[PDB]
Each structure stands twice: as structure tokens, then as C-alpha cells.
Amino acid sequence: SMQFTGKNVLITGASKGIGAEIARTLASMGLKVWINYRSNAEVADALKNELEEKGYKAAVIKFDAASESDFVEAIQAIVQSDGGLSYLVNNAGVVRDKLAIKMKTEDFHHVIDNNLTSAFIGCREALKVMSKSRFGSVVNIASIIGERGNMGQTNYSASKGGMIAMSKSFAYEGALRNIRFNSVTPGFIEADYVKNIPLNRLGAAKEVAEAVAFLLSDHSSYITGETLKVNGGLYM
Amino acid sequence: SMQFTGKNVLITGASKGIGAEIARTLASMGLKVWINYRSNAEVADALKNELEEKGYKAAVIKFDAASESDFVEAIQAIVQSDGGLSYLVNNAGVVRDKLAIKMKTEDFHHVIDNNLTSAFIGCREALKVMSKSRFGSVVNIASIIGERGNMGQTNYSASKGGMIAMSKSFAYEGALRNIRFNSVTPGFIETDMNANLKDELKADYVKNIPLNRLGAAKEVAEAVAFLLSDHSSYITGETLKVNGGLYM
Amino acid sequence: SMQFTGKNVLITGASKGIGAEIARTLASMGLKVWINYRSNAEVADALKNELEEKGYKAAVIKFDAASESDFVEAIQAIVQSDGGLSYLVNNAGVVRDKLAIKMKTEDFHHVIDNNLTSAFIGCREALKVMSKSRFGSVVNIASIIGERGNMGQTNYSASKGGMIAMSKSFAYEGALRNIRFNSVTPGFIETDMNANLKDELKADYVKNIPLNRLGAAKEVAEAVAFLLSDHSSYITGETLKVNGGLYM
Amino acid sequence: SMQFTGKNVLITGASKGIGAEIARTLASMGLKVWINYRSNAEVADALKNELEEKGYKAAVIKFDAASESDFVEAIQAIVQSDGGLSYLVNNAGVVRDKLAIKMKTEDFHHVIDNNLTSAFIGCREALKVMSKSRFGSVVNIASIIGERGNMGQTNYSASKGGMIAMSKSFAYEGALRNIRFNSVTPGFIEADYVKNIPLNRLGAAKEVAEAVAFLLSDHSSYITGETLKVNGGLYM
Amino acid sequence: FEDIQAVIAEQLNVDAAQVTPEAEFVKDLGADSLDVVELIMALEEKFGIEIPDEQAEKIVNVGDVVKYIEDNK
Amino acid sequence: FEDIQAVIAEQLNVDAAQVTPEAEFVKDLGADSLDVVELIMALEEKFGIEIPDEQAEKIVNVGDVVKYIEDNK
């Protein structure tokens, strides 16, 4: 457990994987989790059935991370459900990995608009909602690639690295009302590459979730604009 | 001067300012420069005429670097004209600075496609055309906000940081055939982007540069030249910083 | 609170300031803390008495962390007392700030052996004693000048940067047995190092922190706690930054 | 070739290897090189015999990089030979690589005092000599290890990383009289590790030398406090 | 006007006597920037609908907000 | 004194009339820091030998450099 002065969190793309279990962890710490799905709701409902069976608070929502009006409408509906929003985890992510010579401009705009523009909308809405309350925390999930780069991921790396830089800029803008923006760059998360990780194992999603939790927490209070490398030593 | 195995460079958005200086600098070092212009070609044309009256090889070309097909056909035309392209400088950049709460997504995409996406098209076509000669140097013009971040600069910061990360990835993709990609992070550089700016907000930056002065576009240009030259033949994927100490 | 598989931590130079807060913070989270003191033990002893009257496990210990043999014997004594040592925080730090032209090498070595060398001895003995249980977390207290650099701060900057690089190397050496090393780069932290400092030079920093405030030692302490806890079980060799935005 | 507003350079540990050929390159660009040796002079003399046979200007000097008085006396003697000093290349470097458990405090102080303290002396002397002239450039040779770290090099990595941080601080102090301080981190310089370098080859010493030359040059005029990664992509 | 006085004065800790119709927000009422944008956004919370950028670009005094709001009423 | 006037005034672009024996270097003659250290170092170039830190620590006016130099003569 950790302190959380805030009350609820919204987690984009949280029906499965990492997203699902940031929801699962944050709810275990007493926060109301807003699990976002984009296509099916059988799995997102199953997640909050697991949650509420365990006595935590969960609630699902449908909206495309890429869409400004859908995301904005949503954030609005959560504000008037719960009387405001406290924390955001910009998690929605997709890849289309190709060599550059085999990659077109659409294979690039997809990953940009769908990995990066979503996070821009989210952080800007964060500024908007959390200003009166003078409090909040936002965490963008980035990658190790947004830092070192990878062969075959010219679009994914651009999207993440831009996310990190923008995120620093959002931290600048949100500090004036006591809002923290930070970034988490996971390494490889669950086998050739294991030899390259010093901890000699694939990171589990619960570790990335607990890192996000520390960042949203009040144990990160003077931490803004940082980029938290959760890679087991894969990049230093 | 410096020492280049290559012959020709393409420099996007090189009609004025920083890009104009990179063009002059590489022209004076024996390279044949391909100045690029989006709209008014009078300024560009004047730059080429200056370079040619100095006895240098220069030539103007008009695409929108954010347009894929335009960029591809102009690089194809350059290959057909000079028998190949050696060096690329992705310089095209625009800024729209607004607070994030007043910023529409149009103002985000504007900066993303202009500053980031054009660089992607340039790097890919550079791979394509330099693959065969297995030789090449590309330099993307990022910014210090691509690294540090800034206020009212969410779109610009996103574009520049994406540029740096994607440039690293391109260094990996093209290293095997000796195609080197690198970046440059200028500090406060006294060109058109910065002229119209509050004087007491501008004197706030001279405070934080240890070199106590505004950087000139020629000083960015010469670092770009060094990264293109044969001297940096073992430097790929570096994000060389030219801010006079404003960031370290 | 947080969640620690370990039982005990050794925190060098924890009698007052930041180190005092890391000690309080870990004591309140169920860990048994070993406060360290170089000279006057009255302050340390008072800190332990405070922690124990809160119903916490604390104990004071006196080495000079720059002395190899002293450090080794005190860690050996801790192992003999508690049956092993789980966590380490290399916090001992001193500053002598002078311009480089007035700085003797005595003033360089002073800061090097106090701030850098003690951390090395701590990290090595942590490897030694945590190797057998194959579990452990060490956190070195670097600084923002370890990253950014500063004026009149050549010795301090050297020591902190060396700390970060050496801490990365220790992360490699100890990763295989699940011994994680990490670092912390605080910004302006309102403890004894900074109290006696020009007020109009000190208000020059509030300008450049976006959070618009001086950081408290407890806020550094809780980040240290998170890096020690079981939450960061996949984080080794990170240089986590706690400067309120002063550096990004 | 490149511009050099200055006149002479001093290069510590320049009898062989990298050092020898920074001397060899800088002299090829018209600068007077001061080749420093510490033990034998047969090789340092041989270097300047190669140089002056080729029509460049070279001159040898004997002084321990680790010694404050020896280094200070020297810099002084070069100032009154040549009427001043323009550029410095802090190059002297030694390693003693061991696992940490097999490494003592002396195996660490050797590398610190002998890789790091030397560079401190050099940069401080640089401040001292070059202040009146209001001009100069200093370049410290660091490493990739001073950046990412290596297993078995806990002392070498500390020395280099501290060198880089101090060097940034020297850049702060020297900017007030127009003196630039910068750093060069070479990768692996002349075979298991070749697979890890993207350029798929060991870097040659001439490349590190030409990087140092660009940094000392007037093509680096607004470049101070930077850390120039000459690693072929090994670390990004 | 009276209500506009009160709301702008609440919005940035300023006494009602400060707000004279030619009191600039930054040079006079002492405001940063985002605070002004938020003031505007606050004044659209009295439904002056999207007083457009063109007037955000043209606003600096507090008589400046009587205009563009009685216009967009 | 006259020569000390001239050399300190040369050292940091200041008119000889500025240097009155209680003219502080930073608050009055307007100096940064390193410049003062260098002034001192310049005054040891007239061989006042190592006017020691204890006096560097105690120096701020220009009557302050008549002292410690007529002392260390």
C-alpha cells in the first residue's frame, strides 16, 4: 500500500496486460479505477468482476484514446460521476514494426496518432480537470525504445520519445497548479533477449504497475518530469 | 574547411535562417548544396545566387517535406540529376507555441507533421538511395526542448523528442551499410523563430547560458558539417548538443 | 507505508538532515535502522530515542565511512548482531565549494574520499554480505550537480558523477544475485548544507524550479524507500531524479 | 584541416596509442603539439621524429599527470616557451579491472588519482593560463563506461563519470572567460564485443582524435559541457 | 460589471478596488499567463460562448472583458 | 595607493574616480567573483606573496587591499 491523497484514476487501454494490472494494483491501494476498453467489454467486465469480487472499486468505460471528442467527453463524465478526477495513466499503446524501407507513411501515422496523440489529449485534459483542485498526478507509459531506439521500430520509437519530451513539457505547465507529469520506460515485459537483461529475466507487469503507482503516489511529491527506467538494467 | 567523401547534400527548409547557414557552410566546403523552399522561392534563389557568385555549386528545389510523394520524387530527381545523393540534413521545422489548455489538436498535428514526419520521410528515403553506394550521413535538426522540454512547447517538444528517438532507430537500421544518422540540439539561436519575442523574457535566457551570448546559425551549421564530414565516421546515433551550456 | 522483504538497513551519515529523514522514514515502515554518526553522537542518539519512543527499531553506530577497515568491521558487527544486512543507503556527503583557481587538491580529495570513496566501500561490502542471501537493495545519494554540473562545484560534481557511473557498474556486478543498486539526484533540498547561503542567490533557484518550492528531506527519503522496497524489484542501475523539475 | 584560432596544444599521456595520434592529427592541422610522456622517451621522441620528418611542429615533455607540482611547473614552462597555451587534451588513462569483491581500496585510489585527479589539475591549470587571453578549449577523454558502466570496472567507471561531471562544472567556470570544456567517450578502440557495435567494427584511434579535434576547433564554438559519444552506436 | 469585478478578483487574490476598467491584468492586477486563460475560461462558465481567440488575443484590461462578453451575449 | 587604484581599475573596466577606499568591489565597483580572485592573484603579481585566504576571505573594499599588502610587504 501507499498514500494517495487523490481518489480515482483513469487508465487508458486497461482491459488486458500491463493496463489491466495497473488497474488491478491501483484498486488494491484504495483508489477507484476507471478501466478503459476500446473493443470488447467481455474482458474489461471480467477484470472488474475480479476486482469487485475482491472488494475493490472498479468501473469500465468505452472510448477511443485517439479521438479527442470521445476522450474529452469521457473525462467529463468521470468528473461528474465521481465529483472530479485525481490521477491519469496514459497507457494506450500499439506497434507496427517494419524496416524503414518496407514502411509507409500510414504505418507511421497510425503509431503516432494512436500512441502519442492520445497521450497529448489525456495530459491536456489533465491540466483542464485538475486545475481548480490544484492537485494531481499523470504518468505516461513510454518504453526503453523511446530512449535507446530499436531496429525495425522507427515509428514506435518516435512516438515514445516524443511522448517523453512532451511529458516533460506538460510537467512544466502543470507544476503551476501542483500537477506532476512523469514517464515510465519498461524494458521487455512478459526469449533471445534475456541474455541482455542483467537481472536475467523478463520483467513482470506488476513491477511496471508498482512503478506507476509510486509515481502517482505522494512518495513522488517532488518528482516531476522524470523518466523512470523499469528495465532490469537493459539500458542505463 | 572539412573533408567529405560525399558530393551532394539535400537540406530541407534551407531558404533562410539556420538552414541558409548550413547551406552556405557546406557549399563553401566543396559540397554541391540543394537548397529547399516551400513557398516564396525569391529568398532561396537569392541564396543560390550568392553561393554561385562565390564560385560554389548550389541549386534550388521545391517540395513540401511533409508530403511523402513530393519528397520521394524530388530525391529521385536529385539522383537522376547528379547520379546519386550523399548527405541529408533534415532541417525543416515550424513552431506554434500556445498553452496546452488553448492548444487544439490541429496545432499539435501541425507541428508533428511538419517537424517530425518530414524528418521520417527524409531518413527513409536516405536509407533507400544511400543503401546502394553503402555510404551516407544524415543529420536531423532537433532542439534543446527535444531534450529538456519547455512551457507552451508541448507540440514542439513532442516533435523534437520523437525526432531524436527515431533518429537513433534509423542509426540502427542503416549502420550496417555505413549510413550514419545523428542529431543536433541547438540552444537559443538568433534566427527568425526568435526575433519577435519579449525582450525581458529573452534576457531571461542570457542569464542561463554560461557563454553569455545568443548562438549564431553558422555555429549550428558547422556542427552539422562535422557530423556529415568523414571525421565523425565512427559517430552514429549521437545527439550532439550545441546550446552554449544552457543544457548539460 | 511500503513493502520490504528485508529487515535492516545501514544509512551512513544519518544523524541529521536528509539522512535523518531516510532513517525515520524506513523506521516507520517496519525496518530496523542503523543510524551512523562520525563525530557528535548526541544528535544521532536523540534521533534513535525519538524513533524508539515511537515504537520503532533503531540503533546508532560510529564509523568514518571513508575508512575502509572501520566500515568493514561495522558491517561485520551488524551481521553478527542481526544475522545479516538487507539494505544499504550510501548517504554520507560533504561539500567544499570554492572556485577552481582557489581550490587546492586537498579540497578535491576531501570531497572525493568523503562523498565518492565511502560509497564505493559501502557498495562492495554490500555485495559481500548480500551475496549469500542473494537479495539486497542499495541506494547511493548522488546529486543534481552529479548530472548537470555547477560552478564552484568541481570537486562535488566529480564525486557525484563518479558515484552514478560506479553505481551503474555495481548494478552490473550484483544483478545476477538480485542485488540492485540505484541512485537519487535531489534538487535544492532544505537541509544544513544550504541554510547558510545568500538569500538573493537562493531566490535565484526558486525561479528555476517549476514546483516553486524548496524540497524537503522527507521527500528524498520516500524515493529512497521506494528504491529499497520490493516494488522496484525490476529497477537496477536507475538514476532517479528528485529535483522538482529543476533538471529534466 | 580545420580552423584553430589557437596556437599550441598540450596532450597528456601522448606517447602511444590514442594520445600519440591526437598529437599526430593536431600537428597535421598546423598546431604545435606538446607530447607528454611519463616513462620512456624513446617512443615519444620517435613520435616527434615522425612528426618533424613530415614538416609538422612537435615537442616532448616529461611530467606525471598525477602530480600537481610537476604538471603545474610544466604548463608554466610551456607558457614561457611558446608565449602561452591554447588547447588542452586531458588524455592520461589507466585501468585495473577486477570484480568488486576482489578489489581493494588501493586498486580504486590508483585509478581515481591517476585517471581523474590528473584531469582536475589540467582543467584548473587551464582556467589559470587561459584567463588573460580570454580564449581556449579543453577536452577530457572519458569513456563509454563513464556513461553506461561495465561489470568489473567499478573504479574506472567512477573515474570517467566523475571526469565528465567535473568537466561540465569546469565548462561553467570557464565560460566566463570564453573557455570551452567538453568530453569525448570512445567506445571500443583497437573481438567478442564486435556484435554489439552497430557499425560492426572496432573504432580506430584516428576517429577519436578527429572528434577531439572538432571539439578543440572553432566549429565547436557554442559547444561547451557536451559529452561526445564516439562509440559507433554501442551506446545511445 | 460588479459581478465581473468579483469573479476576476476571486480568480486571482485581488481586492475589488484594484479592478478599474483600465487595469491591465499582468502589469496591473499582476497575473501570470495560464491564470488569464483560466480567467477567460471562467468567464465562458457564465456562458459567454467561446469568446474566440481573436478576443483572447485582444484582452488585457478588465474593461476588455466587459467588451466581447456583452458582445457575445 | 595610486598604482593600486590604476591596476584594480584596469582589471575591471572602472574609472579611477570610482575607487574610494571604502568602495566595495561587488556592491560598488560591480565585480563578479572570479574577477575578484583574479584581482587578488593580480596583486600577488606585484609579489605581495600569497596574501592568504584568511585575507581573501576578509577582502571587499579597495582600502582592504592597501591592508594585507602593506602588511605582507
Ligand SMILES: NC(=O)c1ccc[n+]([C@@H]2O[C@H](COP(=O)([O-])OP(=O)(O)OC[C@H]3O[C@@H](n4cnc5c(N)ncnc54)[C@H](OP(=O)(O)O)[C@@H]3O)[C@@H](O)[C@H]2O)c1
Ligand atoms: N509489453 C511490452 O513489452 C512493452 C514494452 C514497453 C512498453 N510497453 C508499453 O506499455 C503499455 C502497455 O503495453 P501492453 O503490453 O499492455 O500493450 P498491449 O499488451 O498490446 O496492451 C495495450 C493496450 O492498449 C490498447 N490501446 C491502443 N490504442 C488504444 C486507444 N486508442 N484507446 C484505448 N486503448 C488503446 C490496446 O487496445 P487494443 O486492444 O485495441 O489493441 C491494448 O488494450 C503501452 O503503452 C506499451 O507501449 C509495453
Ligand SMILES: NC(=O)c1ccc[n+]([C@@H]2O[C@H](COP(=O)([O-])OP(=O)(O)OC[C@H]3O[C@@H](n4cnc5c(N)ncnc54)[C@H](OP(=O)(O)O)[C@@H]3O)[C@@H](O)[C@H]2O)c1
Ligand atoms: N532558432 C532556434 O533557436 C532553433 C533551435 C532549435 C532548432 N532549430 C531548428 O531550426 C530549424 C530552422 O531554423 P530556424 O529556427 O531559423 O527557423 P526558420 O527561420 O523558420 O527557418 C525554418 C525554415 O524551414 C522551412 N520549412 C518548414 N516546414 C517545411 C516543410 N514542410 N518543407 C520545407 N521547408 C519547410 C520554413 O518554412 P517557410 O516556407 O514557412 O518559410 C523555413 O524556411 C528547425 O528544424 C528548428 O526546428 C531552431
Ligand SMILES: NC(=O)c1ccc[n+]([C@@H]2O[C@H](COP(=O)([O-])OP(=O)(O)OC[C@H]3O[C@@H](n4cnc5c(N)ncnc54)[C@H](OP(=O)(O)O)[C@@H]3O)[C@@H](O)[C@H]2O)c1
Ligand atoms: N541538501 C541538498 O540539497 C542535497 C542534494 C543532493 C544530495 N544531497 C546529499 O545529501 C546527503 C546529506 O544530506 P545533507 O545535504 O542534508 O547534508 P548534511 O546536513 O551535512 O548531512 C550530511 C551528513 O553526512 C555525514 N558524513 C559526512 N561524511 C561522513 C563519513 N565519512 N562517514 C559518516 N558520516 C559522514 C555528516 O558529517 P558530520 O559528522 O560532519 O556531521 C552529516 O551527518 C549527502 O550525500 C549529499 O551529498 C544533498
Ligand SMILES: NC(=O)c1ccc[n+]([C@@H]2O[C@H](COP(=O)([O-])OP(=O)(O)OC[C@H]3O[C@@H](n4cnc5c(N)ncnc54)[C@H](OP(=O)(O)O)[C@@H]3O)[C@@H](O)[C@H]2O)c1
Ligand atoms: N583504448 C580504449 O579502448 C579506450 C576506451 C575508452 C577510452 N579510452 C581512453 O582514451 C585515452 C587513451 O586511451 P589509450 O588506449 O591511449 O590508453 P593507453 O593505450 O594505455 O594509453 C594511455 C596513456 O596514458 C598514460 N598515462 C596514464 N597515467 C598517466 C600520467 N599520470 N601521466 C602521463 N601519462 C599517463 C599511459 O601512460 P603509461 O604509459 O605510463 O601507462 C599511456 O601513455 C584514455 O583516457 C583512456 O581512458 C580508451
